[PDB]
Amino acid sequence: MHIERLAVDESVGRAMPPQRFIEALSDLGVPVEFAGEDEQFGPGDAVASFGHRDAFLDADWVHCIRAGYDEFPVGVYEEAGTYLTNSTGIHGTTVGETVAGYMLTFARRLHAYRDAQHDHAWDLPRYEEPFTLAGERVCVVGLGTLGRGVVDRAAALGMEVVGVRRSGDPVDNVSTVYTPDRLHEAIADARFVVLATPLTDETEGMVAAPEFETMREDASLVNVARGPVVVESDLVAALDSGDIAGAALDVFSEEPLPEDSPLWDFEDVLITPHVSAATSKYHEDVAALIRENIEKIATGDELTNRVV
Amino acid sequence: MHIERLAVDESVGRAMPPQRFIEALSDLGVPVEFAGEDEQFGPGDAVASFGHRDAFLDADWVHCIRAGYDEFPVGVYEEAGTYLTNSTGIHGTTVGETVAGYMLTFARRLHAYRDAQHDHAWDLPRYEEPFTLAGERVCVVGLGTLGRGVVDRAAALGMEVVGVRRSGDPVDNVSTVYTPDRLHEAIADARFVVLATPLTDETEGMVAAPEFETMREDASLVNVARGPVVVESDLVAALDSGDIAGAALDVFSEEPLPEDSPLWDFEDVLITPHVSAATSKYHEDVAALIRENIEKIATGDELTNRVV
Ligand SMILES: [Mg+2]
Ligand SMILES: [Mg+2]
Ligand SMILES: [Mg+2]
Ligand SMILES: [Mg+2]
Ligand SMILES: [Mg+2]
Ligand code: NA
Ligand code: NA
Numbered sequence: 001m002h003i004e005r006l007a008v009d010e011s012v013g014r015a016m017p018p019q020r021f022i023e024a025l026s027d028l029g030v031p032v033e034f035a036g037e038d039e040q041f042g043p044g045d046a047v048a049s050f051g052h053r054d055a056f057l058d059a060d061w062v063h064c065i066r067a068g069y070d071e072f073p074v075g076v077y078e079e080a081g082t083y084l085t086n087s088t089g090i091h092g093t094t095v096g097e098t099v100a101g102y103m104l105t106f107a108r109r110l111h112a113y114r115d116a117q118h119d120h121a122w123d124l125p126r127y128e129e130p131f132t133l134a135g136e137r138v139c140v141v142g143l144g145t146l147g148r149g150v151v152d153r154a155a156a157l158g159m160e161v162v163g164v165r166r167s168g169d170p171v172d173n174v175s176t177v178y179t180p181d182r183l184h185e186a187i188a189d190a191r192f193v194v195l196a197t198p199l200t201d202e203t204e205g206m207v208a209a210p211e212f213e214t215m216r217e218d219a220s221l222v223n224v225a226r227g228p229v230v231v232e233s234d235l236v237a238a239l240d241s242g243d244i245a246g247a248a249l250d251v252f253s254e255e256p257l258p259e260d261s262p263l264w265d266f267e268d269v270l271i272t273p274h275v276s277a278a279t280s281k282y283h284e285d286v287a288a289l290i291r292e293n294i295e296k297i298a299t300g301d302e303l304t305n306r307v308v
Numbered sequence: 309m310h311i312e313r314l315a316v317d318e319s320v321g322r323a324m325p326p327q328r329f330i331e332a333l334s335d336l337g338v339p340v341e342f343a344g345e346d347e348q349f350g351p352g353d354a355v356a357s358f359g360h361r362d363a364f365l366d367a368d369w370v371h372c373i374r375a376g377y378d379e380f381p382v383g384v385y386e387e388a389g390t391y392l393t394n395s396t397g398i399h400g401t402t403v404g405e406t407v408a409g410y411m412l413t414f415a416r417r418l419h420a421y422r423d424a425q426h427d428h429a430w431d432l433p434r435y436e437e438p439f440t441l442a443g444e445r446v447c448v449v450g451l452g453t454l455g456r457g458v459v460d461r462a463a464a465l466g467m468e469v470v471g472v473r474r475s476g477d478p479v480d481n482v483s484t485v486y487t488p489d490r491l492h493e494a495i496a497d498a499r500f501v502v503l504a505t506p507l508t509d510e511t512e513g514m515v516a517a518p519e520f521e522t523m524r525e526d527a528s529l530v531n532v533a534r535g536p537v538v539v540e541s542d543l544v545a546a547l548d549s550g551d552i553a554g555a556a557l558d559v560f561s562e563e564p565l566p567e568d569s570p571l572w573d574f575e576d577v578l579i580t581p582h583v584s585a586a587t588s589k590y591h592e593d594v595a596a597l598i599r600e601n602i603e604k605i606a607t608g609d610e611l612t613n614r615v616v
Contacts, residue, residue: 017435093440093466094416100465101412108406110413113580114422120572122564122581127325130586132401156464157405256430264428272421273430278438 001060001083001297004044006290007035011050012065016283021048024287028294048290057082063293065286067091069307077308084307085293090285091277092149095196095224098276100153102222102248103192107133111270134158139190141183141206142197142225143171150194150224162186180206184214192220199226207231212238220246220268224276227252236262239269250276309368311602312352315343319358320373324591329356332595338602356598365390371601373594375399375585377615385616392616393601398593399585400457403504403532406584408461410530410556411446411500415439419578442466447498449491449514450505450533451479458502458532470494488514492522500528507534515539520546528554528576532584535560540571547574558584 006025012018018034025032025048041047041059048063049056052071056062057080064072064086077084105111109125116123138154140147143165154161155173163171164186168179178186183206187193193215197203207221208231215221221244223230232253238244239262246268252261255274263269279285293303314333316326326342333340338354349355349367356371357364360380364370365388372380372394385392413419417433424431446462448455448471455471456479463469463481471479472494476487486494491514495501501523505511515529516539523529529552531538540561546552554576560569563582571577587593601611 093442094438097412097440097442097465098416101409101416101418104405104409104412105418108402108409109583109586110409110418110578110580111422113583114419114578115426116581117572117577117579118423118426120567124581125583125586127590128588130402130583131588132405134401134405153465157408157461158401259428261428264425269425270418270422271425272418273424273432275417275421275432275438278417278433280436280439282435 002044003030003046003060003294003297004042005046006030006032007039007041007045007047007059008032009035009047009049009051009053010037012048014050015065016286021283021287024283025290028291030294046290046294048286061085061293061297063087063286063290072307074308082308083303085289085303085305086307087286087289088305089145090289092145092152094149094277094279095146096149096151096153098250098272099150099194099222099224099248100157102270103133103138103154103159103220104157105270106192106220106246106248106268107131107136112267115267135160136191137162137189138192138194139163139187140174140194140196141186142195142203143174143177144196144198146224147194147196148172150196162190183211187211187219188214189216190219191216192222194222195225195229197225197229199228204228205231207235209234209238209243212243215244217242218245220244220248222248224250227255232263239263239266246270248272250274309605310352311338311354311368311605312350314338314340314354314356314598314602315347315349315367316341317343317355317357317359317361317364318345320356322358323373324594329591329595332591333598336599336602354598354602356594369601369605371395371594371598380615382616390616391611391614393597393611393613394615395594395597396613397453398597400453400460402457402585402587403454404457404459404461406558406580407458407502407530407532407556408465410578411441411462411467411528412465413556413578414500414528414554414576415441415444420575423575444468444499445470445497446500446502447471447494448482448502448504449494450503451482451485452504452506454532455502455504456480458504470498491519495519495527496522497524498527499524500530502530503533503537505533505537507537512536513539515543517542517546517551520551523552525550526553528552528556530556532558535563544570547571547577554578556580558582 045059046061061083067088137160140150140163143163151173162176163174248270250272353367354369355364369391375396377394445468451471451473459481470484471482472486556578558580
């Protein structure tokens with residue numbers, strides 16, 4: 001396979017400035033050009049796109065600019081001899097910093113301070129409220145690249161780190177890995193429980209009223225996975241009842257989070273709008289994978305993040 | 309000198325529950341007991357206190373529960389042969405985590421998301437706004453115990469760390485140490501400038517309109533030193549002008565920060581109420597010190613944090 005051209009599908013606009021992404025791909029070796037919705041693709045063509053189009057199967061190579069290609073018919077890709085790659089594995093830094101910020105927010109009480117700032121109010125916290133992350137336990141549920149991002153920053157801040165993954169196999173910076181059938185054991189002693197798994201059949205609704213009952217009443221839940229990993233009504237009830245102290249939520253069962261949701265009005269909930277992975281450099285991070293795989297097509301090495 | 313007894317001034321209450329403090333002193337070797345705001349103290353008497361009291365000069369040993377000493381008559385403790393210590397060196401964890409939280413707040417935009425939560429509003433940041441700390445420069449001004457706590461967490465989160473101190477000698481986790489006369493050089497390329505120096509003659513007003521001019525316009529000031537290290541009206545002007553982007557301020561020229569201060573109303577300022585060192589275990593931290601120093605009195609070693 002010899003790559004003549006790189007096409008930037010207009011669908012990348014849903015995650016970044018297409019113009020800025022073309023700039024970041026301008027040192028590739030190959031013409032890069034903004035593709036319309038009316039484009040045929042010959043051999044020699046690489047497409048970079050957000051979502052799927054059927055026209056792409058006449059190209060040599062498609063790179064999905066997302067981690068997730070549930071938009072993309074994997075069988076039909078195999079059929080055409082069209083290579084498919086994705087952008088899995090570049091979100092550990094943004095997401096792990098978001099999560100460390102959530103945790104430091106709760107520990108140091110930044111969110112209450114910000115509420116007070118609205119009201120020009122010098123309100124001192126109660127003695128019992130401020131704590132430090134150093135020595136506290138975090139449980140990270142899911143230990144692929146997202147969770148490892150959380151783990152590394154939690155360990156950097158001196159946290160005791162445990163987690164949950166399917167294999168039960170050790171992971172750098174995690175003291176104890178549990179299998180998913182010991183979820184309750186893993187979360188029982190954690191100050192924070194962080195959700196960082198893909199949404200599957202197996203993970204949908206895994207965090208519900210019984211998990212909130214096992215969790216410590218001073219503990220907080222972080223969701224940076226998908227909304228339906230959590231049973232959202234049970235979260236509301238667990239918050240109302242004091243089964244857990246609070247939550248930081250980046251994802252929800254319906255997004256945008258409807259205005260009438262009770263989740264907005266808990267003091268110890270942080271709502272963020274599906275931005276835990278937002279970065280002003282997303283274009284450079286995707287462009288670096290594109291570049292890596294161009295240089296890999298030219299030496300004959302296999303592609304990073306190959307689906308089919 | 310043979311220590312019979314430990315007493316606890318009533319106005320340690322102004323920083324911690326003295327009951328919790330007595331618990332944490334109950335593995336000492338020597339009887340522990342609460343003091344009234346008039347008590348007399350013989351030979352073998354140890355007092356722990358917030359502020360100064362003259363009835364305590366009849367005791368052997370006073371431990372200030374603050375980092376500061378400036379509200380103590382340093383001379384007169386000489387005369388009666390009364391040892392004086394403070395609580396310097398125990399704030400690097402709390403303050404370092406508060407600063408990491410400030411920086412993660414600006415980089416991930418949590419403060420703007422929290423303002424949106426008040427309004428039940430799904431407000432995505434602009435593409436250009438969210439960034440990561442990994443790879444960005446922080447300059448820590450003052451590399452004593454406070455600054456080192458900032459340094460270690462910023463280095464662990466992958467930041468490029470430089471700093472300023474008098475000697476200019478190496479400090480662990482700092483790439484470049486500058487002397488105070490190269491302050492402008494030190495802050496010119498920093499995304500965050502962090503103030504962690506004592507207020508002295510030399511440091512009063514060291515950050516003012518010329519320093520805000522030299523600083524990058526996307527940079528933020530953090531102040532966890534004292535308000536008057538900064539010329540507050542020049543900070544306001546620098547914020548109004550866009551000389552810098554924002555600030556996180558824990559300390560002010562007048563505390564409580566008056567209601568009419570314009571610092572409350574900048575979006576990219578975080579006000580916090582002199583709480584960057586708040587911890588619900590402050591009692592355990594000061595307790596630790598007390599125990600170190602009575603064991604040092606009994607084997608004739610020199611006292612930790614001794615002024616007089
Ligand atoms: Mg194995
Ligand atoms: Mg269950
Ligand atoms: Mg409301
Ligand atoms: Mg100057
Ligand atoms: Mg206002
Ligand atoms: Na619970
Ligand atoms: Na400036």
